[PDB]
């Protein structure tokens, strides 16, 4: 892992987002609205899904 | 009111012109007390001269360097102002560590673990600082991975700097035997390391930091292989003669940074040279696997948490220019993953970034390598990067980052609630 | 709007001669190499 | 220029969503970049 | 605790016939997850001597050493091979302790007087207790013998570990009213605790040596001849290589049929194609994907996963019935008008396993299940997911997929569905290797399950520590 | 003999210039006493170079 | 920094990133009044001397 870093970036292909990172980008009041697609994974405060 | 030191820290960390030799001396001393004591005068003079010519506080990038500077350089060789700035940095560390725990209620232990560790992750030994100099004293549940398998206590072998060690230098590129110094960080300095790297650094640098490692073996056998260093007797001829003797690279590195008139360039080069005997090894990236505490472990018992740290590496805030071809960029954390620094360091990363300009941002959305990209198994996740990417550089931001690491365990909830937090 | 061909039993994807040469050279080199995985584990 | 041989002598125009059938949509640049990136990736990893 | 004492008593009782001495084992979070310890059903052990012969197979060599020849009728020996391998596996007595503890303090808190050289506490989140036996044919025990360990869960899943005697007994053999045996057992205690590793260095497990163990007094002899251990090593090499030689056979078959057909690959999976796609890039991607599959193939590749159910005893009778049902002429009108309804033919859908390899980023998936059905309008194959969803990886230009059928026919697929087809040649290996390395566990009755076979599974027993202990 | 192997390690491996001789560098002779004891690790000559460098550094420490 | 929306513009739908669609200060079609170096990309941009 110490030297294979450029090989990961050597291919020019995108890296998909994740559910938590997509969940971060909502405003406080906008979070609860139906436009938030990540709500189905928010079943528990202490545990993420 | 430690504010004036934090403004100095912000100005020096965000400085493009942060000196080249700072990283090299950081990796050369390697965080070893004896190595710093050997180079004690050189670093003090370099700090004084650099602060005089450039209005910034250098050496701020490495925790070990700043703490050893604050401790040892107090007796002499520094003016009271700079010493007070370094001491104020250590004092900020201590101040936020007091906030980290609940000092009033944490009298006791549970499962032979201190009751403050259950409250905050800062006090938990299972949380490692992203940059490591010495292994911690506690390894109860921590399985450290070097190549594939966990490191049995037989694979860890201490290095001795005094005599020989030719095969150890030959094994520098290799990974499986984890050579370490024969020192173990205590819990207090472990917490201080965690504080400095998690709370202070991203808050001051606004997540624009990055990590790198050196092909140090190839660097030193041409930076110091000049005949001037070989034939050291137990100078003062001319400036040009000194430059030819020392070489172009070292001349570029050291010329005006530690070369006061009371000590010509060659003496400073010799001072830096003696420190090389504590040579260390190549940069490595270590994986930390650990099950949670026995109160957190009630749900999801099989959750082995995956954490990554850098060993024999450095934390940098600007890309080197004289050390480019001998350096490797290693973005590993969601802190210390500035696209600009690693792009300037390596061509492939630069091409990937230019192809995808939206990754150029610094909110922690930069795609880490697939090996390091385990967000869920990490202790720190996306909200820490998102908050730190836009937080103000006030000390209260550092203490807010510290407060966010308060744990969710039922014992932690009890201790928070009895204090009415 | 693009035009596509419908699958059926009769159709076939041919191979260039050079590609087939390279595939067979790689197959022969792999067979003669002797770098078996169980040998790695035994080592 | 012929490597593909087809039973049907006249091609049909594509339709319907990609969930209904398997089709090969393939820009030349995409395929060439895919190959040239994949070739080196295989080499990376007595 | 009680399992070790009971096992000592039981091995003492039967040592006259079996001549197995007991070896007490305790395992922790290094060998199995907390879920696996919480849901463990059976623990099994099997002894293999230095000649590579299992305890339970004829000494002079058996018919299982003969090769198998790819036919589904005599499927790798039929039910008799399954019965032999059932006979060779022996079952031990075990206990599960789900709450965190350290063995030193736990045994001191029990009646046993531990007497280890140094008071180093060894902590573990959960403990599973077991005792296994290793057989000495006479009063002599060999250091080249190897002992296998298996843990069995209610889903029929199992994991295999094997370690040899010289690690188990590295130093043990060099250290040489009325009283109830329990009293002197507790009063004599234990003093030596050692760590043992699997041959592959993958599992750490602890062994306890109770001084009042009956095997002490037999003054048995122990030795480890060098040629004997060399034989053990080469036999182990022979055992470990089964899946890899099978994968190499698949490789060589793929290359052979690719040579035979002149490189012209006909379509076998239905997918739309274009005359003006560059197929040279597709061919080179196929080469790279094939090389990557050769590199990353594992024990859980589709070919082994499909071979595994072929070895179950039901396969031979099912093969006979299916072949007899295919071996039919046109039905007479009498049977159509009168009598039972016609026998149901083979279904229009099948269950398959496949290996998918990606060239864009280094990534393969091995234990992938897929459902196969034939498209009526074209007669070609369509791959559906386990939920019924259509598999789109056929369209993806960076992907090549290897499929294997239940009857050991395999399809190699590059983009567009143009395929390479050949049969698996399990001819290369003896029946013993295939039948020993892989075989589905067959359940033996225990607590909490219906005596009537085929009934719905009740609640999993799940001895647990998160609840108050049940009584 | 030993002259061939000694000249090997000092010139082909170490690439040190000839004008620095044995008597002009005592730590060089002390290291060459142990350097010849290993026949491998002669491909990464930079390792021997680095060891000689840090042993020279160790010699000139006043502590 | 203030010109773009750093917390929302993580994505892409062309050669142009989302930052190009939210602010003209980022996209390459608006050249500065004074130029010495030609920019990296000129997909839908042409220079007429």
Curated annotation (Swiss-Prot), chain A:
Places the protein is found: Virion; Host nucleus
Family: Belongs to the herpesviridae major capsid protein family.
Assembly with partners or alone: Homomultimer. Makes the hexons and eleven out of twelve pentons. Interacts with triplex proteins 1/TRX1 and 2/TRX2; adjacent capsomers are linked together in groups of three by triplexes, heterotrimeric complexes composed of one molecule of TRX1 and two molecules of TRX2. Interacts with scaffold protein; this interaction allows efficient MCP transport to the host nucleus. Interacts with capsid vertex component 2/CVC2. Interacts with the small capsomere-interacting protein/SCP.
Primary role: Self-assembles to form an icosahedral capsid with a T=16 symmetry, about 200 nm in diameter, and consisting of 150 hexons and 12 pentons (total of 162 capsomers). Hexons form the edges and faces of the capsid and are each composed of six MCP molecules. In contrast, one penton is found at each of the 12 vertices. Eleven of the pentons are MCP pentamers, while the last vertex is occupied by the portal complex.
Protein's recorded name: Major capsid protein
Curated annotation (Swiss-Prot), chain D:
Subcellular localization(s) per the UniProt record: Virion; Host nucleus
Lineage: superkingdom: Viruses
Renumbered residue ranges of the record's region Interaction with major capsid protein/MCP: 1-45
Job description of the protein: Capsid vertex-specific component that plays a role during viral DNA encapsidation, assuring correct genome cleavage and presumably stabilizing capsids that contain full-length viral genomes. Participates in the interaction between the capsid and the tegument through interaction with the large tegument protein/LTP.
Family of the protein in this entry: Belongs to the herpesviridae CVC2 protein family.
Quaternary structure and partners: Heterodimerizes with CVC1. Interacts with major capsid protein/MCP and triplex capsid protein 1/TRX1 at the pentamer vertices. Interacts with the large tegument protein/LTP.
Name used for this protein in its record: Capsid vertex component 2
Lineage summary: Viruses, Duplodnaviria, Heunggongvirae, Peploviricota, Herviviricetes
Gene expressing this chain: CVC2
UniProtKB/Swiss-Prot annotation, chain E:
Residues spanning the signal sequence: none
Compositional bias annotation for Acidic residues: 61-76
Pfam family, one: Herpes_UL17
GO cellular component terms, A-Z: host cell nucleus; viral capsid
GO biological process: chromosome organization; viral DNA genome packaging
Residue ranges, annotated region (Disordered): 52-77, 322-347, 454-471
Keywords per UniProt: Capsid protein, Host nucleus, Late protein, Viral genome packaging, Viral release from host cell, Virion
Protein's cellular compartments: Virion; Host nucleus
UniProt keyword Acyltransferase, yes or no: no
Summary of subunit composition and partner proteins: Interacts (via C-terminus) with capsid vertex component 2/CVC2.
Family designation: Belongs to the herpesviridae CVC1 protein family.
Functional summary from the UniProt entry: Capsid vertex-specific component that plays a role during viral DNA encapsidation, assuring correct genome cleavage and presumably stabilizing capsids that contain full-length viral genomes.
Protein name, as recorded: Capsid vertex component 1
UniProtKB/Swiss-Prot annotation, chain F:
Assembly notes: Interacts with the major capsid protein/MCP.
Keywords: Capsid protein, Host nucleus, Virion
Similarity annotation: Belongs to the herpesviridae small capsomere-interacting protein family.
One GO term of the biological process aspect: viral process
Part of the full-length chain shown: 13 to 75 of 75
Function field: Participates in the assembly of the infectious particles by decorating the outer surface of the capsid shell and thus forming a layer between the capsid and the tegument. Complexes composed of the major capsid protein and small capsomere-interacting protein/SCP assemble together in the host cytoplasm and are translocated to the nucleus, where they accumulate and participate in capsid assembly.
A GO-annotated cellular component: host cell nucleus
Keyword set includes Metal-binding: no
Full protein name: Small capsomere-interacting protein
Location of the protein in the cell: Virion; Host nucleus
